[PDB]
Design a protein around this ligand. Structure first.
Ligand SMILES: COc1ccccc1-c1c[nH]c2ncc(-c3cncc(C(=O)N(C)C)c3)cc12
Length: 281
C-alpha cells in the first residue's frame, strides 16, 4: 500500500466551503460541499488551540452510532485543519423545537426524540465515554424526526469513573451537575444530569432553563433541593425521570441504559395511539 495512506484523511480541495452554519452559533463550523459526491457537509476548522481540535477529531474516529452525528473525514496533515461531518438538514434541536408546528411535533415525537438521544448516550455510557455538553443546541435533526447528538469537543474516553477538568475551567451553569460546578468533577452521571435538563428543553419546546433565576443563584437553589417545575403538558412519568436525573448524589441518578428502556417503552405505547389517531383522519 501507499506509505502515507490514512483512511480518515481527505484532500481539502475536495471540499467547497460556503458559509458559517447555525448563524455562527457554533463558531468556526461551516456548511460545505464534498464536490466529488455532491454531498452537503458540515466542516469545523481552526482560525489562524490545535490540541483540542485534534483531540475532537480523534474521538470522532472512535464512536459510531445511529444517533451520534457521523465523522466523514478530516484534513489534519497541514493547516488549516478540517473536521468534516455529515450535515443534518433540519439544523439543531433547540431551534427546531422553537420554530416547529406542535400538531406535527406532538407528544409522541417528543418521546421519540428523547428515546433516540438516550440511545446514543447508552452507547457512550457502555463505551465509558462522557460527552460533557449535552443540550438541545447540541442535538441535530434530520428527516422524519431523526435526531443525533453532536459537538464532541469536550467528549472523553474515561479511564476511571470520573474526569477532572482543567483548573479555572468554567461551564454552562444551567446544564451542569452540582458536583461539576463545585469540584470540576465529571462522569457519566453528570451527563445524566445534563440529559435531564435537555428533557426539560424538549418538554417546553425549547425554553431557556431556570426561567427568571440568576445564574449566580442556581447552585444555592439546587443545594436546597429546588428543581425546575413540571412543564405544562409533560407526562408525570417523564417529569419523574427528569427528577431522577437531578438527584443530588450522582450515584442516585439512573443509568442511560435504564433511561433508554423507560423511553422506548413510553414511546411505543404512545406510538400506538398515534398510529390509530393518524388512521382516522
Ligand atoms: C450541533 O452541531 C455541531 C456542533 C459542532 C460542530 C459541528 C456540528 C454539526 C455537525 N453536522 C451538523 N449539521 C448541521 C448543523 C446545523 C445546526 N444548526 C443550524 C444549521 C443551519 O444553518 N441550517 C440551515 C440547517 C446547521 C450542525 C452540525
Amino acid at each position: 500500500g501507499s506509505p502515507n495512506y490514512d483512511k480518515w484523511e481527505m484532500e481539502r480541495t475536495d471540499i467547497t466551503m460556503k458559509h458559517k452554519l447555525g448563524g455562527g452559533q457554533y463558531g468556526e463550523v461551516y456548511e460545505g460541499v464534498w464536490k466529488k459526491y455532491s454531498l452537503t457537509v458540515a466542516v469545523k476548522t481552526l482560525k489562524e488551540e490545535v490540541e483540542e481540535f485534534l483531540k475532537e477529531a480523534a474521538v470522532m474516529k472512535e464512536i459510531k452510532h445511529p444517533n451520534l452525528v457521523q465523522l466523514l473525514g478530516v484534513c489534519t496533515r497541514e493547516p488549516p485543519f478540517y473536521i468534516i461531518i455529515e450535515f443534518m438538514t433540519y439544523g439543531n434541536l433547540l431551534d427546531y423545537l422553537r420554530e416547529c408546528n406542535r400538531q406535527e411535533v406532538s407528544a409522541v415525537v417528543l418521546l421519540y426524540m428523547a428515546t433516540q438521544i438516550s440511545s446514543a448516550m447508552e452507547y457512550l455510557e457502555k463505551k465509558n465515554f462522557i460527552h460533557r455538553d449535552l443540550a438541545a443546541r447540541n442535538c441535530l435533526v434530520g428527516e422524519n424526526h431523526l435526531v443525533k447528538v453532536a459537538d464532541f469537543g469536550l467528549s472523553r474516553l474515561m479511564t476511571g469513573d470520573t474526569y477532572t477538568a482543567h483548573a479555572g475551567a468554567k461551564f454552562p451553569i444551567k446544564w451542569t451537575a452540582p458536583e461539576s460546578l463545585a469540584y470540576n468533577k465529571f462522569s457519566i452521571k453528570s451527563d445524566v444530569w445534563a440529559f435531564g435538563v435537555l428533557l426539560w428543553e424538549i418538554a417546553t419546546y425549547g425554553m431557556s432553563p431556570y426561567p427568571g433565576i440568576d445564574l449566580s443563584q442556581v447552585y444555592e437553589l439546587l443545594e436546597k433541593d429546588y428543581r425546575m417545575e413540571r412543564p405544562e403538558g409533560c407526562p408525570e412519568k417523564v417529569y419523574e425521570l427528569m427528577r431522577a436525573c437531578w438527584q443530588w448524589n450522582p450515584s442516585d441518578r439512573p443509568s442511560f441504559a435504564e433511561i433508554h428502556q423507560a423511553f422506548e417503552t413510553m414511546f411505543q405505547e404512545s406510538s400506538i395511539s398515534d398510529e390509530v389517531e393518524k388512521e382516522l383522519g
